[PDB]
Amino acid sequence: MTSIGTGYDLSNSVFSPDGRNFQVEYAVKAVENGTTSIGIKCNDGVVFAVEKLITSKLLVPQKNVKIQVVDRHIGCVYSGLIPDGRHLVNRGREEAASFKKLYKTPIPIPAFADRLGQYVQAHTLYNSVRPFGVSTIFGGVDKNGAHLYMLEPSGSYWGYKGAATGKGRQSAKAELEKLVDHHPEGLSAREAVKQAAKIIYLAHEDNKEKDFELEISWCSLSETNGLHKFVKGDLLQEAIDFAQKE
Amino acid sequence: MFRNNYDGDTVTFSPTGRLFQVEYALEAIKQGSVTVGLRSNTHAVLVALKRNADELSSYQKKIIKCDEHMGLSLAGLAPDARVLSNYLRQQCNYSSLVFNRKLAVERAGHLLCDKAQKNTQSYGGRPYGVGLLIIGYDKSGAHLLEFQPSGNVTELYGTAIGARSQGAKTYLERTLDTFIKIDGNPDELIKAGVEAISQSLRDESLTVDNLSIAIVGKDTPFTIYDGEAVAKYI
Amino acid sequence: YDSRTTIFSPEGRLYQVEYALESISHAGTAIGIMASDGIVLAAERKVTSTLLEQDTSTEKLYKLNDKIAVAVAGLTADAEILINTARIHAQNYLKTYNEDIPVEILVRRLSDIKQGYTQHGGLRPFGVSFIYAGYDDRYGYQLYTSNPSGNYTGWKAISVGANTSAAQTLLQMDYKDDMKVDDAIELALKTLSKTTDLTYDRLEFATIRKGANDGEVYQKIFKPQEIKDILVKTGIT
Amino acid sequence: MFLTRSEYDRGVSTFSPEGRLFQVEYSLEAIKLGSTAIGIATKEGVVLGVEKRATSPLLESDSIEKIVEIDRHIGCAMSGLTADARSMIEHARTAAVTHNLYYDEDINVESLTQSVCDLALRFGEGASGEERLMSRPFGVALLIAGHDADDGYQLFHAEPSGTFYRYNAKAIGSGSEGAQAELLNEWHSSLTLKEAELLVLKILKQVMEEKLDENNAQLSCITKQDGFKIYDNEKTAELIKELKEKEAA
Amino acid sequence: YDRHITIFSPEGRLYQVEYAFKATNQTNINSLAVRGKDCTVVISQKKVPDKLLDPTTVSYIFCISRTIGMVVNGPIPDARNAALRAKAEAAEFRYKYGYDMPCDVLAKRMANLSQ
Amino acid sequence: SIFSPDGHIFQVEYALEAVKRGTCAVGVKGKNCVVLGCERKLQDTRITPSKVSKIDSHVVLSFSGLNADSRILIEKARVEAQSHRLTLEDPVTVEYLTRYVAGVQQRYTQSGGVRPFGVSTLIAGFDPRDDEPKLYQTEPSGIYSSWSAQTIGRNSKTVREFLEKNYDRKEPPATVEECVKLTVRSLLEVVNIEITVVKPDSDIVALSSEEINQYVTQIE
Amino acid sequence: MSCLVLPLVSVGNIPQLSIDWLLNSQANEWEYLEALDSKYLVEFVGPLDRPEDGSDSLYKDADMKYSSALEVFYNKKRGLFAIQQRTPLVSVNYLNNFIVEIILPFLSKYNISEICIWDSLYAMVDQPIFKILFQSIKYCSCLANEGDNSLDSQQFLQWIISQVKFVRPISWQGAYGMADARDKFVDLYN
Amino acid sequence: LEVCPVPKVEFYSTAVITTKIMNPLFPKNLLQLTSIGEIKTTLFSFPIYSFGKTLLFSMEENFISISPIFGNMISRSIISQLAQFSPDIIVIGTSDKIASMKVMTENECTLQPPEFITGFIGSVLTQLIVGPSKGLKFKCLVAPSEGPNGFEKLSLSDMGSLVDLCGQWLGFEPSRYSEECYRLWRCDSAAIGAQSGLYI
Amino acid sequence: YSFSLTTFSPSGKLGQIDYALTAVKQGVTSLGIKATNGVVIATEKKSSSPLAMSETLSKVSLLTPDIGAVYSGMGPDYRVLVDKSRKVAHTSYKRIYGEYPPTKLLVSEVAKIMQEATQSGGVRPFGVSLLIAGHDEFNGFSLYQVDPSGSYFPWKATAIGKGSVAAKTFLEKRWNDELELEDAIHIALLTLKESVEGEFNGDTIELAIIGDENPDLLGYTGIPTDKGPRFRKLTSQEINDRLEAL
C-alpha cells in the first residue's frame, strides 16, 4: 500500500525504503486465493477443518486429502499453493523425527512451531528462493496441553484460540470470534468439531459457485489419546448435518 | 505488459501472487498431443494420440510403464517426461527391494509432487513442463492421477490433457456414471477411452500408427498396446 | 555487461582488461633500462605530502629474490599479492632444482596468473603493470613487462604508468644498443624529468649490476640520500 | 496496450508465456548453419551421405570428416556446429563398447541413440537426475544409422534438445527443407541399396550450390554383414558416373 | 545494485541497511531497559488487538541464557532468528570457555554477525 | 543469451572477432617441408616469446589472436605430447595433436564461467616415420581442418587470395627455399617477419632476421 | 490557449501510461482527432480502447474500427492536444526525422502555443537535447522503476495536474494476460 | 544529430499481402506461381508472384538483419500502387500480441484490447485504414505466434486453421491444398517443436 | 554473487573503493603523530546518545603489546578488522617465531585482508581507514595508514576523516623531527580541538601512545629479559590533566 513496490518487489529479501519485503506480501496474495482452512483450540485438544473445492465431478470423493499428520500428535492444514504446503510438512516431519531421536519425548508444540517458523523465515533471507505460498494452521497436544498456531509466508507465527486462512477467512474469523465470546468456560472437542463444520460451511459462500467437500481432523486427550486422527463416520456426518441446519 | 516484469524466473511472485513461470509451464502441455485416462473399480486405462514428424518418421511413444502395476502417459516436454518417469521407476523399485512392497499409486503421486515442487521454489532450474496421467492397481484398487507442472497431483475418475483435450474431458464428465462401472470387462473400458479421445480429434482419424493404449487392473499387469494390437478398437 | 570480467564484447574485446589498463595509465610512471652490464629501475611516486615518511618504505620497487626485482604501476595492494606469489614461486624452483629461477620462467608464471583472471572465475583483474629486472646465467640481464591482459614482452628499455608515450619517445631517442649502466641511469632520470606532472622524495631507484668485486650480481635499492646525490651529479639539482 | 520488449528467449531455463524453451529451439535452429547430410534406409542397408563444403580450394577436403563410425554396426552423420559432435561421438562409442563389455552383445541402435540424447540433456537435469555437465545445449544434430537383430535397419535423427525420431529417410542441415520433400516423393519400401545410394547423390546435387563431385560429397553405408563402411572417392565417383548416365531418360 | 544489496552508494552509504532500520518500527511498539543497583529491567509494549490470538504466546522478550535476556524491536520472524542464534552462541561459549557468556560479549558477537 | 535466434553461439562468434584483430599468421606445405610465417620496436626480441612454439621435436604450433590465451593451449599441448609418448610409446601424429588442441578449445565453449580461447592456430610438422608434410588449422569453436596452405588473423582474406592463385597443389613448392619464399611473399601483401622451417624427423629451424632479409629484399 | 502534450517512450512507459489515466479519467471532455504518420515508428493496428467505467468510447466516429500507432486527442473545452503512442521509434536514428517531419508540422498546424513533454528517468544526451535543438516549452523527466506502474503513473498524473476519479482504459484488464487468473490458480494448486 | 535517409522504394483481381512465414499456404506448383521483381535502397529486394489471376506480395522479415523501416516503406508503396486499381485485398500474418486466431475486415475489428498487431502486416494494415489511399476493402487473417520477426513459431492447430480459411478464401479444394500445405508446414522451422520431438 | 562487486569503470577507476573512501571521509576525525621517542594516535568519541556509555566502546585498539590502531569510517568494519588483525598476528607470526610481528608486516597483513574485500566475489570493500602505530626492535617507531583499497603509506604525521584537511595542515606547521612524545601528545590535542564540535574532555577523546616499555603492565615479575608492553592508552584523568594546563 503502495500495494506494488516498484523497484523493490522484483526479488526476495530486498528491503523497500519503508522496510517492507514485497515478495513476502505478494506470497500472501496467493494464500488469499486458496480454499478456507481453520483451527479451533478446544478444552483438551485441537480441531482442524478445510474447504475442498469440487472443481469437477471427475474428482473422486474423499480422496485428495489435504490435512497432514506430523509425527503422531500434530496436524497441519494450509491454504494457498498446496505443494508448498507439502514441502513445509516434509521439513516438519524431519525436524520432529530429529528432535524425537535425540531427546526421546515427542516434539512439544511450541518447539515444533519454531522449527517451521525458522525454516519459513529462512526463505525470506535470500533471492535464490521464494517465500512459501501458504499459511499453515497446525498444533496438537503435549505435556502442557492443547496448542494451536498459524504461520504466515513471512515466518511470523503466534498461538491462537481459533485460526482461519484462505479465501473465506474474514467470514470464518467472524464466526470464530462469536464462538470465543459465547464460550468463556471452554469448548469440548466434539462441540468444536460440529462448530468447525458450520464455520467451513459459512465460509464456503465465497466459493459458492463450486461444490465442496468438508475435511475435519482432531487431536484430543479424551477423544484420541492425544494422537492426530481424522474425524470420520457418524461424528463426521453428525457435524455435516449440524452445519447444514444453520 | 505488466506480467513481463514478474515472469523471469520461478522464484518471483507477481503482485497478485502468481508464479508466471509455473503458469507458463502449464502451457507447455497444450503443445503436446491429447491423452486420456479413465477407470472403473477393476481396471485403469490410458489412451494416447501419437504424433509423427512427417510420412517418413515414426510416431512418438506417449505411454511409459513404471512397474508391473503402474505406468503413465505424457503430454508436453518429452525430456521432462523421461526424467520424471525414470524417477518413478526408481521409487517403485526402491519400494520393492527394501520393503518387498508395491509402491501405492497415491504414494507415487506424492513423491512426484514433492520432486516437481522443488523446481518451482529455487533459482537455477525451471518447473517441469509436462503433464502426466498415472494409472495403477494397488491394495486399495484402481487409480488415476493427474500431474501438473506445479507439482500438484489430483486423484480422478477420468481426465484428458494436451492439445484439444477439452472435448475428451467433457465427454468423460458426461459419461462418468457409466465408465466407472465397467468392471471385469477390460475391452469395454478401453472402448470408452477410445471414444473419449475421439472427441479431441480435429480432421484426423485414429489409426494403427497413431493410437496407443495402456491397461492395468486386478490380475492384469500394466500392458501397452500399439500397432496391430490396437486394431480391434478402431 | 562490461562489468563481467570473463566475457567477450561483440568486437571480441575484453572490457575489464581494457579498463584495468586505463587505471594503470594514471599510475606513477616507472622506467626500466637495460645496459650491457646492468639494468636500471626507476619509479616516480604517485603520492606526495611533506609529512610522508619517504625513507623506510620503498613501495613501487620490490626484490623478488637476490637476482630479480620489479617496478610496479597500479594498485599497490594488488601488486603485493602477485609479488608474494612470485617470491614463493622463485623459492619453490630453488627448492626443486637447487638453482635460481630463470627470469623468464618467473615472469611467465605471473603472466599466467594474470591471464587466468581474464578467462575464468568472474573476478576483476589485478590493476597492475610490472617491469621485471633480473639476471640469470642463460640470458644475462633481462627486462620484461606484464599487464592485466596477461601478456608479457622483453625490452631493451621501457616505461609503464602515466605519460608512457612521452617517455617511450625520449627513450627511442637516446638509447644506444650497448650503453653503460651509469649512462642508463642518467637517461632514466632525464626521461622521468621530462614527463613529471622532480625531487628525490618523489623517486625510488634500483640497479642490478656486476659487483666488480667480483664476477657477481648485485641488487641495490637506493636510499633517499643516494637518490639525492645522483640527482645532482647528473645536473637535475 | 503498448509494445514493450520481451525477455522470453534469454535463459535456457526460461519458458515463454506459451510454454516454449526458446534457447533450446535456437539450438535446433543451429543445424541450418550446417552443411547438408542425408540418410536413406532400405531392407538391404542404410545409406548416409554428406555435403563436404570446402570453404576454399586450399582446404584438403579429405580431412572433412562429417561421417564417423560409432561401432561396427552403427555409423553416423553430423550437421550443424560440428565441433559439438566431439562429446556425442565419444559418448556413443563408449556406450556401444561398454554395452558389449557388460552384456556380450551389440548395443541396440535405438539404445545408442537414446544414449546420445541423454548426454544432450546435460545442459540441465539428467535423465536419471544427474547434475548438469555443460553450460549450453549442443548446436549439432546427428543421423545415426545401423542394424541390430531386433529391429533390422534403422535410421534415427538425434536433436540437440535430447530428443529423437526414427526415419525411413531424413535430410538435415542447410537445404534440407527441399531435400526432405524430395525424399517424401521418391522414397519407397523396396528401394535397393544402389538406388538409395543414387537417390542420395541426386538429392545432394540438387541442393548443393557447387557442382557435385567426389571431393564435395561423401557416401557411406551400414550392412548387416559388412557393417559400417565409408566409401572412398573412387567408389563414389563411379556411383556419380552411373547417376549421370542414368539421367539420360 | 546499490538499492538492493549491501554495496556502497556514491555517498558511501548502505541503503539496504538504512531500510532494515525502518523495518524495526513496523511492529509499532516501544521498549525500554533500565538498570538497578542489582538488577536490569526490560519493558516492552504488547499490542494484541485480534481477540483470536493467545496473548500468552505473543512476546518480543527471550531468555537467551540463565543470565541473559533479550528484547527485540522489529518483526517477529527476524526477531526469533536472532534469538535462536544468540541462544546457540551463549551455549557454545559456556561449553568452550568454561564460564557464562557475558552480556557485552554476546552483544559484540551478534554485532559482528550483523556487520 | 547463449544462442542467437538463427543459432549462432554469441561468445564463440565474439571469439572469432578476437582472432581478426590478431597479427597475421600463415603456413604453407612444400614437397618435403612446411614453412610457418608470422608478422610483428625498442624491445628485446632474443628473450621475448616467439609466435611459433615447438610442441614436441617434430611438431610446431603458431597462432593468431589473444596472445596470452595461446600459452594455455601451448602448455596443454606440450603436456599431452609427453603423456602420449609415455603411454603409447610413440609421439603424437600432427593430426592427433590437432584434435587434442581443438578439443580443448571446444570444451571452453561449453563450460560455465569460462571464456572461449580468442585464438586460432596453425599446427604443423611430420608424423613419426613419415615424410608427408602436415598442416592443420583450429578455431575458437573447436573446428579443425587440413590445409595445403592457410592464413589466420588480420588481412588473412587478402593473404588467402594470394595463396589460392600462387599455390598449386599439382606442383607444391619443390624446395625449402621456394616454400619459404612463397610464405614471405604471402606476408608482404599485408606487412619484421618470422619464418620457421620444419623438415621431416625433427629438423625444426627458425630463420634469423638476416636470412629473412635476404628473402624480402630480393622479392622487392 | 493551446497546448500539446507529447509523451516520450521512456522508462517503464509511464508517460504513455500517464496519458492513459488522463484520457480515460476525463472520458467526456476528450475526443479522437486524427492520426499522425507512423512512418518512423514500429507500426501498429489495434482495436479501440475505451474507459473502464462504462462511459463513451472517445472515438465519436461510429464507422472507425481500428486504432493506430500515433494518435492525437482533443479536449473541446480546456483546449488541449494529447498524443497517445503505442510503439517506439523504428530506430534511434530517426528521432530527428520524427521531430522534424511529424512533430514540428503538427505544431505549426493547429497553432499550438506550448508543448509539454513527459519523460521518465532511470538510475543508469537524453532525447530532449536531440529534440530541443530542432527548435513556450514545459517539462521533462521523472524518477522511475519498472514495472507494474499502474500506480506510479497515476501519482505522476496526480502530480502534474497541480498544476478526480480515476478510470483505467479497459486494455489494462489484460495487462497480466488474457487468460483468467482464477482459472490458472485452480488448475495448478487446488 | 540530423535527419537520416529513408528507404527509396522502387516498384489483376485479388492481392495477397503477407510475410515469408506463410509460404506453406502457397504451394509453388499446385497453384503455379510466376514472378516479377521489387527493389528498394538506403544510404534488399524481393520478388512479386502471380497465380495467375491473383498477386502475392510476401515480404521477408528478419529481426536480426532487416530493420522495419524497410517494410514500412514497402507497405507504403504496395498499398498506394494498389489503391488505383481497387482490388480485393487479403492480409495474412501473425502476432505475439493476440490470444486466438483472428479474422478481420475493413469494418470489423475482432481484436480485443489489449491485443494488437505489428510490424509489417501492421504497417500494411495502417496504410489500408489510415493515411492516404485509405478505404480499400480487405479481409485479414492473423494467427497467434511467438518468437522474433522471421523466426516465428506456431501451434499445429493454428497452422491448420490458416490452411482451411486461406484455401477457402482462395477457393481451392480442401484436399489437395490441405495436403500440400501441411507438407510444407512440417518442413518449416515454425513447427520445429513438433518436428524435433521436443513436445509430444 | 560469485563475481567481483568491485569492478573497473571505463575511466579505469574502481567505484566501490572510491565510495568506501567517501564513507571514510565522512567519519569522525582521527590522527597520528610520530615522535623521536614514541608515536601518538587519537580520535574523538562522539557518543550517539547521552544514555550511551562510550567507555564500553573502544576506537583505539591494542593489536600487539607494541602496536595499536585507530580509524575513521564505519565502526563495525573496524571492530571486525581488529579481531582479524589480532588473530593473524598469532597465526602467521607469533606461533611460528614466538615473537610478535614488527609493525610494517602486521600493517601488511591487514592490507591484504582489505585488498581481498575489493576483489573476492560477493563482497563490498571495508569502509574504514586505519592508522596504525607500532614499535619493533629493528625498525623502531612507525606509523601507517591503511585504506579501503589495501594501500598503505608510512607517515611522520597525518589525519583522516572529516576534519583531515585542516588537521593535516595544522600538523604540517607544528611538526618537526625532534618532537618528544610529550610534544606529540600536546600537538595531537591542539589538533583534535579544531575538529571537535561540542564537548572536549578526557571523556570524548580517546588517546593512546606507543612509547617506553611498561614493566608494570606485564602482570608478572621474574623474567628480566621480558619486556613490558610499549602500547598504553591514556585514562580520562590523564587526558583532562593535560587539557587544563593545555
XYZ file of N, CA and C in Angstrom, chain C residues 15-155:
423
model
N 36.571 -6.058 -21.918
C 36.447 -4.716 -21.354
C 37.185 -4.495 -20.043
N 36.982 -5.383 -19.073
C 37.602 -5.215 -17.758
C 39.125 -5.125 -17.875
N 39.687 -5.891 -18.812
C 41.121 -5.875 -19.073
C 41.507 -4.497 -19.574
N 40.710 -3.974 -20.498
C 40.971 -2.666 -21.098
C 40.868 -1.524 -20.093
N 39.892 -1.620 -19.194
C 39.675 -0.591 -18.173
C 40.755 -0.652 -17.090
N 41.177 -1.870 -16.754
C 42.310 -2.065 -15.863
C 43.543 -1.368 -16.449
N 43.728 -1.499 -17.756
C 44.811 -0.776 -18.426
C 44.640 0.741 -18.329
N 43.407 1.241 -18.463
C 43.172 2.679 -18.262
C 43.642 3.119 -16.878
N 43.301 2.337 -15.859
C 43.650 2.687 -14.492
C 45.153 2.819 -14.327
N 45.884 1.908 -14.960
C 47.342 1.891 -14.886
C 47.996 3.109 -15.539
N 47.407 3.574 -16.638
C 47.907 4.751 -17.340
C 47.795 6.024 -16.493
N 47.188 5.912 -15.316
C 47.086 7.035 -14.397
C 47.963 6.834 -13.166
N 48.772 5.778 -13.169
C 49.644 5.498 -12.031
C 50.998 6.182 -12.185
N 51.739 6.266 -11.083
C 53.097 6.779 -11.104
C 53.944 6.088 -12.152
N 54.666 6.878 -12.937
C 55.485 6.348 -14.022
C 56.667 5.499 -13.520
N 56.906 4.382 -14.199
C 58.051 3.538 -13.914
C 58.836 3.295 -15.197
N 60.158 3.454 -15.140
C 61.017 3.147 -16.288
C 61.938 1.964 -15.984
N 62.342 1.252 -17.029
C 63.373 0.241 -16.933
C 64.289 0.315 -18.142
N 65.594 0.344 -17.895
C 66.558 0.425 -18.980
C 67.657 -0.614 -18.817
N 67.867 -1.413 -19.858
C 68.930 -2.410 -19.850
C 70.215 -1.909 -20.501
N 71.300 -1.932 -19.729
C 72.638 -1.639 -20.233
C 73.362 -2.949 -20.494
N 74.558 -2.862 -21.064
C 75.337 -4.050 -21.410
C 75.760 -4.829 -20.167
N 75.898 -4.107 -19.058
C 76.468 -4.638 -17.826
C 75.589 -4.333 -16.623
N 74.289 -4.179 -16.857
C 73.379 -3.840 -15.781
C 72.010 -3.354 -16.218
N 71.098 -3.243 -15.260
C 69.747 -2.778 -15.533
C 69.377 -1.690 -14.531
N 68.513 -0.767 -14.948
C 68.068 0.306 -14.075
C 66.549 0.317 -13.940
N 66.055 0.374 -12.706
C 64.627 0.567 -12.448
C 64.388 1.880 -11.722
N 63.396 2.631 -12.190
C 63.059 3.918 -11.596
C 61.550 4.079 -11.543
N 61.054 4.598 -10.426
C 59.627 4.840 -10.278
C 59.405 6.186 -9.622
N 58.571 7.013 -10.250
C 58.179 8.286 -9.662
C 56.953 8.034 -8.789
N 57.011 8.498 -7.542
C 55.964 8.229 -6.559
C 54.682 9.000 -6.849
N 53.563 8.278 -6.884
C 52.257 8.886 -7.124
C 51.905 9.890 -6.020
N 52.014 9.439 -4.773
C 51.596 10.218 -3.610
C 52.690 11.174 -3.109
N 52.302 12.420 -2.832
C 53.219 13.399 -2.256
C 52.571 14.263 -1.181
N 53.094 14.140 0.030
C 52.865 15.106 1.090
C 54.229 15.309 1.713
N 54.398 16.396 2.446
C 55.679 16.649 3.081
C 55.785 15.768 4.330
N 54.626 15.369 4.846
C 54.586 14.543 6.047
C 54.782 13.049 5.778
N 54.853 12.658 4.506
C 55.100 11.262 4.143
C 56.494 10.833 4.534
N 56.593 9.673 5.178
C 57.874 9.143 5.637
C 58.608 8.495 4.470
N 59.398 9.298 3.763
C 59.964 8.897 2.478
C 60.988 7.768 2.574
N 61.850 7.825 3.583
C 62.769 6.726 3.843
C 62.011 5.597 4.528
N 62.596 4.402 4.519
C 61.977 3.221 5.118
C 60.581 2.972 4.558
N 60.531 2.498 3.319
C 59.272 2.129 2.689
C 59.561 1.350 1.425
N 60.015 2.079 0.407
C 60.076 1.614 -0.983
C 58.842 0.802 -1.401
N 57.874 1.496 -1.995
C 56.573 0.904 -2.263
C 56.216 0.846 -3.739
N 57.225 0.868 -4.602
C 56.993 0.715 -6.033
C 58.004 -0.247 -6.646
N 59.128 -0.423 -5.954
C 60.147 -1.386 -6.351
C 60.237 -2.488 -5.300
N 60.406 -3.733 -5.742
C 60.455 -4.880 -4.825
C 61.457 -5.959 -5.258
N 62.296 -6.407 -4.328
C 63.123 -7.581 -4.585
C 62.220 -8.795 -4.603
N 62.338 -9.600 -5.654
C 61.667 -10.896 -5.708
C 62.603 -12.005 -5.226
N 63.888 -11.850 -5.513
C 64.917 -12.673 -4.898
C 66.240 -11.920 -5.024
N 67.358 -12.608 -4.836
C 68.670 -11.982 -4.975
C 68.934 -11.420 -6.372
N 68.261 -11.943 -7.390
C 68.646 -11.611 -8.757
C 67.578 -10.891 -9.575
N 66.368 -10.792 -9.034
C 65.223 -10.273 -9.780
C 64.438 -9.234 -8.970
N 64.142 -8.094 -9.583
C 63.326 -7.072 -8.927
C 62.185 -6.674 -9.836
N 61.154 -6.047 -9.271
C 60.089 -5.475 -10.083
C 59.796 -4.032 -9.731
N 59.296 -3.316 -10.730
C 58.784 -1.976 -10.547
C 57.291 -2.070 -10.806
N 56.496 -1.415 -9.966
C 55.035 -1.528 -10.040
C 54.369 -0.267 -10.595
N 53.291 -0.444 -11.353
C 52.387 0.661 -11.674
C 50.940 0.185 -11.581
N 50.176 0.817 -10.698
C 48.806 0.414 -10.431
C 48.504 0.347 -8.939
N 47.468 -0.406 -8.589
C 47.101 -0.561 -7.188
C 48.261 -1.244 -6.487
N 48.881 -0.550 -5.542
C 49.994 -1.137 -4.817
C 49.600 -2.411 -4.064
N 48.363 -2.477 -3.578
C 47.924 -3.646 -2.814
C 47.678 -4.846 -3.718
N 47.245 -4.582 -4.948
C 47.124 -5.629 -5.955
C 48.487 -6.241 -6.221
N 49.458 -5.367 -6.448
C 50.841 -5.749 -6.663
C 51.371 -6.686 -5.586
N 51.155 -6.326 -4.319
C 51.712 -7.089 -3.201
C 51.296 -8.550 -3.239
N 50.037 -8.793 -3.584
C 49.564 -10.156 -3.742
C 50.438 -10.942 -4.731
N 50.561 -10.432 -5.953
C 51.354 -11.083 -7.002
C 52.851 -11.104 -6.692
N 53.339 -10.109 -5.966
C 54.749 -10.096 -5.611
C 55.009 -11.263 -4.683
N 54.085 -11.475 -3.762
C 54.247 -12.575 -2.840
C 54.161 -13.971 -3.489
N 53.278 -14.156 -4.467
C 53.247 -15.446 -5.154
C 54.569 -15.696 -5.900
N 55.104 -14.642 -6.513
C 56.362 -14.704 -7.243
C 57.536 -15.110 -6.360
N 57.640 -14.507 -5.187
C 58.742 -14.813 -4.292
C 58.677 -16.282 -3.903
N 57.448 -16.767 -3.761
C 57.203 -18.162 -3.433
C 57.551 -19.062 -4.614
N 57.157 -18.656 -5.815
C 57.475 -19.446 -6.995
C 58.982 -19.584 -7.139
N 59.699 -18.473 -6.974
C 61.163 -18.475 -7.057
C 61.822 -19.402 -6.014
N 61.209 -19.496 -4.833
C 61.760 -20.330 -3.769
C 61.479 -21.809 -4.007
N 60.302 -22.119 -4.551
C 59.964 -23.485 -4.932
C 60.911 -24.015 -6.008
N 61.196 -23.176 -6.999
C 62.120 -23.557 -8.058
C 63.504 -23.822 -7.456
N 63.945 -22.950 -6.561
C 65.225 -23.162 -5.901
C 65.219 -24.460 -5.098
N 64.073 -24.801 -4.520
C 63.982 -25.986 -3.692
C 63.953 -27.259 -4.531
N 63.365 -27.172 -5.714
C 63.221 -28.326 -6.596
C 64.508 -28.635 -7.361
N 65.196 -27.591 -7.811
C 66.306 -27.765 -8.730
C 67.637 -27.425 -8.135
N 67.611 -26.789 -6.971
C 68.810 -26.194 -6.404
C 69.568 -25.273 -7.365
N 68.781 -24.511 -8.116
C 69.245 -23.414 -8.955
C 68.309 -22.201 -8.801
N 68.821 -21.012 -9.084
C 67.972 -19.826 -9.055
C 67.045 -19.870 -10.259
N 65.869 -19.283 -10.107
C 64.879 -19.346 -11.166
C 65.263 -18.434 -12.328
N 65.241 -18.982 -13.550
C 65.391 -18.167 -14.759
C 64.317 -17.084 -14.817
N 64.738 -15.848 -15.081
C 63.863 -14.675 -15.044
C 62.579 -14.881 -15.848
N 62.716 -15.339 -17.089
C 61.546 -15.541 -17.934
C 60.546 -16.531 -17.334
N 61.041 -17.525 -16.598
C 60.153 -18.535 -16.014
C 59.275 -17.941 -14.893
N 59.876 -17.101 -14.060
C 59.139 -16.365 -13.042
C 58.136 -15.414 -13.693
N 58.561 -14.751 -14.771
C 57.712 -13.788 -15.462
C 56.472 -14.472 -16.080
N 56.700 -15.627 -16.718
C 55.659 -16.364 -17.433
C 54.567 -16.830 -16.492
N 54.984 -17.257 -15.304
C 54.063 -17.713 -14.273
C 53.140 -16.591 -13.769
N 53.701 -15.437 -13.419
C 52.870 -14.296 -13.043
C 51.960 -13.873 -14.205
N 52.492 -13.895 -15.427
C 51.683 -13.584 -16.609
C 50.534 -14.576 -16.774
N 50.797 -15.837 -16.443
C 49.773 -16.878 -16.473
C 48.687 -16.654 -15.409
N 49.089 -16.161 -14.240
C 48.133 -15.872 -13.186
C 47.215 -14.744 -13.633
N 47.814 -13.705 -14.201
C 47.052 -12.590 -14.741
C 46.107 -13.067 -15.836
N 46.633 -13.850 -16.779
C 45.826 -14.427 -17.853
C 44.621 -15.201 -17.331
N 44.818 -15.968 -16.260
C 43.758 -16.795 -15.720
C 42.520 -15.976 -15.407
N 42.727 -14.858 -14.714
C 41.663 -13.941 -14.321
C 40.875 -13.363 -15.496
N 41.427 -13.466 -16.708
C 40.763 -12.968 -17.915
C 39.918 -14.033 -18.620
N 40.051 -15.286 -18.208
C 39.349 -16.350 -18.912
C 38.346 -17.140 -18.067
N 38.479 -17.091 -16.748
C 37.556 -17.848 -15.912
C 37.467 -17.298 -14.506
N 36.304 -17.436 -13.886
C 36.211 -17.190 -12.460
C 35.451 -15.968 -11.991
N 35.175 -15.037 -12.900
C 34.363 -13.873 -12.567
C 34.944 -12.827 -11.619
N 36.250 -12.858 -11.390
C 36.870 -11.863 -10.525
C 37.555 -10.797 -11.362
N 37.542 -9.555 -10.877
C 38.247 -8.478 -11.561
C 39.734 -8.799 -11.698
N 40.352 -8.298 -12.773
C 41.787 -8.498 -12.956
C 42.539 -7.622 -11.974
N 43.823 -7.910 -11.776
C 44.673 -7.058 -10.956
C 44.954 -5.779 -11.715
N 44.899 -4.662 -11.016
C 45.218 -3.403 -11.643
C 46.683 -3.088 -11.463
N 47.550 -3.912 -12.053
C 48.991 -3.640 -12.027
C 49.717 -3.965 -13.331
N 50.708 -3.140 -13.642
C 51.687 -3.474 -14.665
C 53.040 -3.568 -13.974
N 53.852 -4.524 -14.407
C 55.166 -4.765 -13.818
C 56.273 -4.597 -14.852
N 57.371 -3.982 -14.419
C 58.626 -4.057 -15.149
C 59.576 -4.946 -14.351
N 59.974 -6.068 -14.941
C 60.857 -7.013 -14.267
C 62.296 -6.787 -14.692
N 63.169 -6.559 -13.709
C 64.616 -6.507 -13.937
C 65.284 -7.697 -13.261
N 66.086 -8.435 -14.021
C 66.698 -9.635 -13.491
C 67.933 -10.074 -14.232
N 68.664 -10.991 -13.612
C 69.812 -11.604 -14.250
C 69.769 -13.112 -14.068
N 70.092 -13.840 -15.129
C 70.365 -15.261 -14.992
C 71.485 -15.662 -15.936
N 72.081 -16.822 -15.700
C 73.247 -17.209 -16.470
C 72.908 -17.682 -17.881
N 71.628 -17.920 -18.164
C 71.211 -18.295 -19.518
C 71.137 -17.106 -20.480
N 70.518 -16.018 -20.031
C 70.215 -14.894 -20.906
C 70.832 -13.605 -20.398
N 71.603 -13.691 -19.319
C 72.176 -12.498 -18.727
C 71.102 -11.513 -18.291
N 71.410 -10.225 -18.400
C 70.498 -9.177 -17.964
C 69.240 -9.143 -18.815
N 68.097 -9.001 -18.158
C 66.833 -9.023 -18.866
C 65.857 -8.016 -18.312
N 64.956 -7.583 -19.187
C 63.909 -6.651 -18.823
C 62.599 -7.161 -19.420
N 61.548 -7.239 -18.601
C 60.230 -7.651 -19.095
C 59.136 -6.749 -18.514
N 57.997 -6.695 -19.190
C 56.807 -6.144 -18.567
C 55.692 -7.150 -18.636
N 54.716 -6.989 -17.757
C 53.462 -7.721 -17.861
C 52.326 -6.785 -17.463
N 51.142 -7.012 -18.034
C 49.990 -6.159 -17.773
C 48.734 -7.014 -17.532
N 47.592 -6.391 -17.163
C 46.458 -7.250 -16.784
C 45.923 -8.149 -17.888
N 46.384 -7.975 -19.118
C 45.988 -8.884 -20.182
C 46.639 -10.242 -19.976
N 47.730 -10.263 -19.211
C 48.495 -11.480 -19.017
C 49.530 -11.669 -20.116
N 49.698 -10.627 -20.916
C 50.759 -10.598 -21.899
C 52.069 -10.141 -21.283
N 53.181 -10.589 -21.851
C 54.491 -10.125 -21.416
C 55.452 -10.039 -22.598
N 56.296 -9.019 -22.595
C 57.284 -8.886 -23.650
C 58.610 -8.435 -23.043
N 59.698 -8.729 -23.755
C 61.034 -8.340 -23.350
C 61.422 -7.016 -23.969
N 62.235 -6.247 -23.254
C 62.577 -4.891 -23.666
C 64.061 -4.584 -23.493
